[PDB]
């Protein structure tokens, strides 16, 4: 996801990855996997929508 973000949004966009202590079950995957936070900040409404 980070590589895709830095490619499509070639400009500068900060990231705030934070690790989750325990896995959370997924609906389609039917399994609990370790997750991380996807906090991201950028300017421009169109950029936010993208």
């Amino acid at each position: 996801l980070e590589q895709i973000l830095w490619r499509v949004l070639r400009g500068n966009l900060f990231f705030k990855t934070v690790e989750i202590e325990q896995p959370v079950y997924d609906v389609k995957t039917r399994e609990y996997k370790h997750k991380n936070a996807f906090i991201v900040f950028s300017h421009g409404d169109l950029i936010i929508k993208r």
């Binding site: 400009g11 500068n12 966009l13």
Partner: protein, 51 residues
């Protein structure tokens, strides 16, 4: 390694600041033009009403 992230954040902040300054300057120019237009309109209306 944090130097690159700091530089990227600085570039993003500079781009945002430039966008804000450009928007503010455009708003200021539009407001000056509208002030001239409104002054002309008010002068015309006051001349029509008083005369």
């Amino acid at each position: 390694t944090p130097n690159q992230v700091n530089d990227e954040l600085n570039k993003m902040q500079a781009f945002i600041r430039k966008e804000a300054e450009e928007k503010a300057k455009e708003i200021q120019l539009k407001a000056d033009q509208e002030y001239e237009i409104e002054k002309t309109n008010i002068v015309r209306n006051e001349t029509n009403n008083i005369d």
